[PDB]
């Protein structure tokens, strides 16, 4: 556990810039992340982050597993986003260099731990931007050479 | 040992001036004697001013008289949220400044008028802020809930479905005295079509004297405030018993005064004498606290009650073997020198939780819907820091108060 790159104030600015949008970001303030984080604010951030990186939509957070066998499916949709959110964060946070993520982090967030997580995400997000540039440059190079193919046949 | 009191809302203040009158009257402490032990809150100055201009003027400290020159507003929202808020701190301060000065207190007898602005709203958060600052005490709120057909404010229910839901999770025992059902008593059991508010007040001003005053006063069968809530509430819902008095005879007309116990106790269960339009239409009693005062022989009681326990047509709840808290005091009642109260040498201020209110709440809830169903005066609250939430979500609240008062009874 190194020190988080950013304190809460900086973290808000990076989330506004890179993760949240319009009203959502404008509403985001220090006091809903520290000293006690509003789990539903983190939910939105963690969810939007996943959407951006994995190209995934709100609808995907409402997928019901097939071998659940619950008696009232419609009564369970409040829980689905949590369950899915957790399943994906399991895969994503290790990428952002966070290995000790737990379900209680969503249900009952702690100030320091969640500021460590948001830094790791924000860091990774800055890096994939750098990679995007390199990637899109290669992509433009190959889909332009596939055009000079049909323009030559 | 003590019990502070917070009279909120013009009414709770008028009734306050009254209950406060009866007091000194039976304690030999004229206009200018000791020092009260309560406070007065209102967002309309002119009314608390009446306590500042009229009788019992110097028996109070301009410190236990809180006012908000601003506006009352016969609407919960404004009184609770928006305006009422500004004063609360200050209000509390006294019930924290007056709560300190004492010696091991027991609670705060709150006086409010359910369907008002300063009475419903404000208190809502006053009792609210109390349940947290002194969860370790008694919160018996003495209310004057909405006349069954003779209401005043046009919105009344909005204000009373809202004071109930917000206070419910904060009170210990809520006493209830129905303004209209008290008139009947003034028409049928005292005869007078000229009942000034100043009378109903003398009445509750009586039934109340039987609660605190005399009870906190030595006797042959003392009953502490805690005692109540314990022997009176079967369940956490700030349960609301009903107040009833026995010798409500006229000090002019008839005169059979000498009405031995055996009589005054039977006169409590007949529905036409209970300061509440909740006629035991079916409501099974589930606990009664028969507070007697004056010359009473414990056997007389432990017999007069026995006779009752076997009248059956008075059906008590199932899960309740015996629900009769016999409270005996010494000093007989003390009637206003020349009002209209008989003046007997013994009385019975019996209060109780009756599955009856299943009604009273019902009939008051229904009211609400009708209007909410059209939003009626909703814009008056919204524009006062409230939302479709607080209403709809306080309606659902009482809903489970119609089921509660139904389940705890009618079933075995």
């Amino acid at each position: 556990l190194s020190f988080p790159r950013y304190n809460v104030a900086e973290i808000v600015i990076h989330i506004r810039n890179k993760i949240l949008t319009g009203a959502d970001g404008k509403n985001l303030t220090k006091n809903d992340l520290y000293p006690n984080p509003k789990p539903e604010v983190l939910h939105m951030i963690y969810m939007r982050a996943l959407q951006i990186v994995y190209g995934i939509r709100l609808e995907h957070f409402y997928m019901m597993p097939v071998n659940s066998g619950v008696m009232y499916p419609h009564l369970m949709e409040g829980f689905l986003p949590f369950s899915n959110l957790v399943t994906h964060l399991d895969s994503f946070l290790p990428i952002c260099r966070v290995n000790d993520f737990e379900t209680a982090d969503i249900l009952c967030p702690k100030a320091k731990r969640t500021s460590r997580f948001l830094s790791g995400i924000i860091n990774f997000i800055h890096f994939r931007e750098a990679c995007r540039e390199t990637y899109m440059e290669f992509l433009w190079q190959y889909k332009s050479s596939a055009d000079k193919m049909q323009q030559l046949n | 040992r003590e019990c502070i009191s917070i009279h909120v809302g013009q009414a709770g203040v008028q009734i306050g001036n009254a209950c406060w009158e009866l007091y000194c009257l039976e304690h030999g402490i004229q206009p200018d004697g000791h020092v009260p032990r309560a406070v007065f809150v209102d967002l309309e100055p002119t009314v608390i001013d009446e306590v500042r201009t009229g009788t019992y003027r110097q028996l109070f400290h301009p410190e236990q008289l809180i006012t908000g020159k601003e506006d009352a507003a016969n609407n919960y929202a404004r009184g609770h949220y928006t305006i009422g808020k500004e004063i609360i701190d200050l209000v509390l301060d006294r019930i924290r400044k007056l709560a300190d000065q004492c010696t091991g207190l027991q609670g705060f007898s709150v006086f409010h008028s359910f369907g008002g602005g300063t009475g419903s709203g404000f208190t809502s958060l006053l009792m609210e802020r109390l349940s947290v600052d002194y969860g370790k005490k008694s919160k018996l709120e003495f209310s004057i809930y909405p006349a069954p057909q003779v209401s005043t404010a046009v919105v009344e229910p909005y204000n009373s479905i809202l004071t109930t839901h917000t206070t419910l999770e904060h009170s210990d025992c809520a006493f209830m005295v129905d303004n209209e059902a008290i008139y009947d008593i003034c028409r049928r059991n005292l005869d007078i079509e000229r009942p000034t508010y100043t009378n109903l007040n003398r009445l509750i001003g009586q039934i109340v004297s039987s609660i605190t005053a005399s009870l906190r006063f030595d006797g042959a069968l003392n009953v502490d405030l805690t005692e109540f809530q314990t022997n009176l509430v079967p369940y956490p819902r700030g349960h609301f018993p009903l107040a009833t008095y026995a010798p409500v005879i006229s000090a002019e007309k008839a005169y059979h005064e000498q009405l031995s116990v055996a009589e005054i106790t039977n006169a409590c269960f007949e529905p036409a004498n209970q300061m509440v339009k909740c006629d035991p239409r079916h409501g099974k009693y589930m606990a009664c606290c028969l507070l007697y005062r004056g010359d009473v022989v414990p056997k007389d009681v432990n017999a007069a009650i026995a006779t009752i326990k076997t009248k059956r047509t008075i059906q008590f709840v199932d899960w309740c073997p015996t629900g009769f808290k016999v409270g005996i005091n010494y000093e007989p009642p003390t009637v206003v020198p020349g009002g209209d109260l008989a003046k007997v040498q013994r009385a019975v201020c019996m209060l109780s939780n009756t599955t009856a209110i299943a009604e009273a709440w019902a009939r008051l809830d229904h009211k609400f819907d009708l209007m909410y169903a059209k939003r009626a005066f909703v814009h008056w609250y919204v524009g006062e820091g409230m939302e479709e939430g607080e209403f709809s979500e306080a309606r659902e609240d009482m809903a489970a108060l119609e089921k509660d008062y139904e389940e705890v009874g009618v079933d075995s």
Binding site: - | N74, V154, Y183, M371, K374
Partner: protein
């Protein structure tokens, strides 16, 4: 608490003289004199309408707005006329033309700033402001136009304090003007969207109520005015008195307006008996509700019996039993369940002061919010169309910098206002 009266136009002005003629006596304030008050209670709450300067000179805190000198110069040259501080007189020596447009866009629009100026000097007087009283007629320039502007500005400056409006809606049978529906429809429009309590009076609903409910054979204007002013005293000032159950503008507002339009009421006084004879004293109380709730006796033109009520406010002011009051109201609510709307379990808002009208034993102002007033805006709205269609005296408006879409606007608006009100009659 407080309020600041507003005498817009001549009428609204003429009435000012009567509203203050009264009120003062109901507060022991002689011309420039002080408080001669027979009692000591007619003083602890005066502030609501005056200001402390000298020590014997409590000056009415109202505004006198008018583009016709002669008028205010008749009110200022007569009886109580010399009690208003000159600063109060916001005149407009211009041509007070009888055009709504001439007193709302062209001529009045200038004199406005020099008014708001004072309406602020008075508001920032002291203590806490409640609202402003507004008198005028919706059948002229300085009344409907310029006064209807005064409010549109007031309601932008303090969307908190209330706004009672006393309008002299154009009487039916005969119109004391010709464009009347023009000046009217245009002002009601402004009303339905700024003031939040309007008390509509009809010069002919008064005559009637003044020639048959007061065998009075020569009902001069002074009278009508006097009767009206009698009601507006019961309303405000009154409630600023003690009472077993007192209310105040807001209560009145927060119990009478189910839906934000603002809705207009119809005031009715209680003891309305002819002098000598009639002095029957049948005023135990059932006699007052008998009165107040009958058709005739409603200062409005329309008859309640022609449409349910949404709210009612019997603002009584004279020692009585909260029982014989609270009770009566009920039977009344049951004998006429028919018209009293149902989705409001207790339409009536019982109010109860203590001290009564100086010389009387028991009175009770009535402020009804009945759906019946639908059949009046209808009237007005009709007159408009029948003449708008031909653009009758429209050149006097447009030629004053108006719009052909402005008239359209108002009618519709106020016309829709009729619609809505029916949504409850059903």
């Amino acid at each position: 608490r407080e309020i600041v009266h507003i005498q817009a136009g001549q009428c609204g002005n003429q009435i000012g003289a009567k509203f203050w003629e009264v009120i003062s006596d109901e507060h022991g304030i002689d011309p420039t004199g002080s408080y001669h008050g027979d009692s000591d209670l007619q003083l602890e709450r005066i502030n609501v309408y005056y200001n402390e300067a000298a020590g014997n000179k409590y000056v009415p805190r109202a505004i006198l707005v008018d583009l016709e000198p002669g008028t205010m110069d008749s009110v200022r040259s007569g009886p109580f006329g010399q009690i208003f501080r000159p600063d109060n007189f916001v005149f407009g020596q211009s041509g007070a033309g009888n055009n709504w447009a001439k007193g709302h866009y062209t001529e009045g629009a200038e004199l406005v700033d020099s008014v708001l100026d004072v309406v602020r000097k008075e508001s920032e007087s002291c203590d806490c402001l409640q609202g402003f009283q507004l008198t005028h007629s919706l059948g002229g320039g300085t009344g409907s136009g310029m006064g209807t502007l005064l409010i549109s500005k007031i309601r932008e400056e303090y969307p908190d304090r209330i706004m009672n409006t006393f309008s002299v809606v154009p009487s039916p049978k005969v119109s004391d003007t010709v464009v009347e529906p023009y000046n009217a429809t245009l002002s009601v429009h402004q009303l339905v969207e700024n003031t939040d309590e309007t008390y509509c009076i009809d010069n002919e609903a008064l005559y009637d109520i003044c020639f048959r409910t007061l065998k009075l054979t020569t009902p001069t204007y002074g009278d009508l005015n006097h009767l009206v002013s009698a009601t507006m005293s019961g309303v405000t000032t009154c409630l600023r008195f003690p009472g077993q159950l007192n209310a105040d503008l807001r209560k009145l507002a927060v119990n009478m307006v189910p839906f934000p339009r603002l809705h207009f009421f119809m005031p009715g006084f209680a003891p309305l008996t002819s002098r000598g004879s009639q002095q029957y004293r049948a005023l135990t109380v059932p006699e007052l509700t008998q009165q107040m709730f009958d058709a005739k006796n409603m200062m409005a033109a329309c008859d309640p019996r022609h449409g349910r009520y949404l709210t009612v406010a019997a603002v009584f002011r004279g020692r009585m039993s909260m029982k014989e009051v609270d009770e009566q109201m009920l039977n009344v609510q049951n004998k006429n369940s028919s018209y009293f709307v149902e989705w409001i379990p207790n339409n009536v808002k019982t109010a109860v002061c203590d001290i009564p009208p100086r010389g009387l034993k028991m009175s009770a102002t009535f402020i009804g919010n009945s759906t019946a007033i639908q059949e009046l805006f209808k009237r007005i709205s009709e007159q408009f169309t029948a003449m708008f269609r031909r653009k009758a005296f429209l050149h006097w408006y447009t030629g004053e910098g108006m719009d052909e879409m402005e008239f359209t606007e108002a009618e519709s608006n106020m016309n829709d206002l009729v619609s809505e009100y029916q949504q409850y009659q059903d």
